[PDB]
């Protein structure tokens, strides 16, 4: 009877599939790519030659028979089936939805693709950055703040402007001390900040592509002349697998309503983990891992007739790398500075934790 299907192999889904496989529980991991994407490092991968090969990890080397590359197009709840484009139906005793989020390319790569194509996409982007003397980053959230710092750190000679629609940078959940220091670090690197300005001609702009002249405009009348436009304008919940089947149980974002055991509302053998769960914390790979531990444990506790584990958030820990040499953040809601973030995140961007989880060695 027992068989756990995991929709999505991001941070959540490979933590779940690793755990299930190590317990020899019957399971199937489904993802549209052939490789796990360490997207935490995607921004460095768009800046450093030869780095992208280190951010994609073949699923089938790690999971073999229990991994299927396919696009989930629906879930049949009365027959307990996951429906794949091309006609495959996977039955389940327990379902884990780990579909994460979608957004503009450099920061997210969600295509039915091979590892070699994915890698080449990032290598193309490095060549775009390298060619461009003038670069605009759109969006001053936690993503675009890292984009701008990565460019200016790897190429100080380049001119980098960041345009953000708010008065302060990065997440509104962060201690004001972290958000002020993000700004100051950006300024000390030489990044041009254009705050409280929304870019207004986005739908006409060539993206991720060097041009001799691109005119960027804002809603306050500012014009910025540039060679390259990179979008860090934010993400959307990827509800493509499940929106039809779970329509009544969705948040307004598209995320799934859960209880503290991460069971989807109305169900006992369906769980949501990571960005697609309607937990009201910022979207973090770290929390994806923690939701994977709870969901896998609760499937086992659910079948073993043991009480279930609960998720109760602690104070926000959140680190911003500011190039490979700098950064700032907070640990359990307390400020931390360059030395800590530099070695914990900035140097490696957690890449080697994904290789370890996957039992592979980086190329």
Ligand X SMILES: Cc1cc2c(nc3c(=O)[nH]c(=O)nc-3n2C[C@H](O)[C@H](O)[C@H](O)COP(=O)(O)OP(=O)(O)OC[C@H]2O[C@@H](n3cnc4c(N)ncnc43)[C@H](O)[C@@H]2O)c(O)c1C
Ligand Y SMILES: NC(=O)c1ccc[n+]([C@@H]2O[C@H](COP(=O)([O-])OP(=O)(O)OC[C@H]3O[C@@H](n4cnc5c(N)ncnc54)[C@H](OP(=O)(O)O)[C@@H]3O)[C@@H](O)[C@H]2O)c1
Among 59, 122, 210, 318, binds ligand Y (CB under 6 A): 318
Based on the shown chain and the rule CB under 6 A, indicate whether residue 153 belongs to the binding site for ligand X. no
**Closest distance of CB 273 from ligand X, Å:** 7
**Is 44 marked within a binding site?**
yes
Stretch binding ligand Y (CB under 6 A), from 92-100, 160-168, 241-249, 262-270? 160-168
Among 190, 286, 315, 325, binds ligand X (CB under 6 A): 286
Based on the shown chain and the rule CB under 6 A, indicate whether residue 198 belongs to the binding site for ligand Y. yes
Q: What angle do CA 138, 32, 15 make, to 5 degrees?
A: 85
Q: What angle do CA 63, 67, 69 make, to 5 degrees?
A: 135
Based on the shown chain and the rule CB under 6 A, indicate whether residue 241 belongs to the binding site for ligand X. yes
Based on the shown chain and the rule CB under 6 A, indicate whether residue 345 belongs to the binding site for ligand X. yes
CB-based contact 170:330 (threshold 8 Å): no
- Beginning with the edge strand found earlier in the chain, give each strand of the sheet holding 334-336 in spatial order: 318-321, 327-331, 334-336
Based on the shown chain and the rule CB under 6 A, indicate whether residue 327 belongs to the binding site for ligand X. no
215: β partners: 225
**Is 221 marked within a binding site?**
no
Based on the shown chain and the rule CB under 6 A, indicate whether residue 199 belongs to the binding site for ligand Y. yes
Report in angstroms the alpha-carbon separations of 85 from 7, 258, 290.
13, 27, 30
Which among ligand X, ligand Y, none contacts residue 31 (Cβ within 5 to 8 A by kind)? ligand X
**Closest distance of CB 184 from ligand X, Å:** 19
Rounded Cα–Cα distance for residues 329 and 338 (Å): 9
Report in angstroms the alpha-carbon separations of 178 from 17, 107, 117, 311, 320.
35, 22, 37, 26, 9
Look at residues 203, 189, 221, 211 and name the one whose alpha carbon lies nearest to residue 138.
203
SS3 category, 216: strand
**Which of 344-348's residues contact partners 24+ apart within 8 Å by CB, and which partners?**
344/319, 345/319, 345/321, 346/321, 346/322
Which among ligand X, ligand Y, none contacts residue 238 (Cβ within 5 to 8 A by kind)? ligand X
Based on the shown chain and the rule CB under 6 A, indicate whether residue 143 belongs to the binding site for ligand Y. yes
Task: Please give the residue ranges that form the binding site for ligand Y (CB under 6 A).
Answer: 138-144, 163-166, 171, 198-199, 202, 232-235, 282-284, 318-320
Residues near ligand X (CB under 6 A)? 7-13, 30-33, 37, 39-40, 43, 71-72, 98-101, 107, 110, 143, 146, 238, 240-241, 274-275, 283-286, 288, 319, 321, 345
């Amino acid at each position: 009877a027992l068989h756990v299907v995991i929709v999505g192999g991001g941070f959540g889904g490979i933590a779940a599939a690793s755990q299930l496989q190590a317990l020899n529980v019957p399971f199937m991991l489904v993802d549209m790519k052939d490789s796990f994407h360490h997207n935490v490092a995607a921004l460095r991968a768009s800046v450093e030659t030869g780095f992208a090969k280190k951010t994609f990890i073949s699923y089938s080397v790690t999971f073999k028979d229990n991994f299927r590359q396919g696009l989930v197009v629906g879930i049949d709840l009365k027959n307990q089936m996951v429906l794949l484009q091309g006609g495959e139906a996977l039955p389940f005793s327990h379902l884990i939805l780990a579909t994460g989020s979608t957004g503009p390319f450099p920061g997210k790569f969600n295509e039915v693709s091979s590892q070699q194509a994915a890698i080449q996409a990032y290598e193309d982007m490095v060549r775009q950055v390298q060619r461009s003397r003038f670069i605009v980053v759109v969006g001053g959230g936690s993503a675009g703040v890292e984009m701008a710092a990565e460019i200016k750190t790897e190429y100080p000679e380049k001119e980098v402007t960041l345009i953000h629609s708010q008065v302060a940078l990065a997440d509104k959940e962060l201690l004001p001390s972290v958000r002020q220091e993000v700004k100051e670090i950006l300024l000390r690197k030489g990044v041009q900040l254009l705050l409280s300005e929304r870019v207004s001609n986005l739908e006409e702009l060539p993206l991720n592509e060097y041009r001799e002249y691109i005119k960027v405009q804002t809603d306050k009348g500012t014009e910025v002349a540039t060679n390259l436009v990179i979008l860090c304008t934010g993400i959307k919940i990827n509800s493509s697998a499940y929106r039809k089947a779970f329509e009544s149980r969705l948040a307004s974002s598209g995320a799934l309503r859960v209880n503290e055991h991460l069971q989807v509302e109305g169900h006992s053998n369906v769980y949501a983990i990571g960005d697609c769960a309607d937990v009201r914390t910022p979207k973090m790979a770290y929390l994806a891992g923690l939701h994977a531990n709870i969901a896998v444990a609760n499937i086992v506790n659910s079948v073993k007739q043991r009480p279930l584990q609960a998720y109760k958030p602690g104070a926000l820990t959140f680190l911003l790398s500011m190039g490979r040499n700098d950064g700032v953040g907070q640990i359990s809601g307390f400020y931390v500075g360059r030395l800590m973030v530099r070695l914990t995140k900035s140097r490696d961007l957690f890449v080697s934790t994904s290789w370890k989880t996957m039992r592979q060695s980086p190329p």
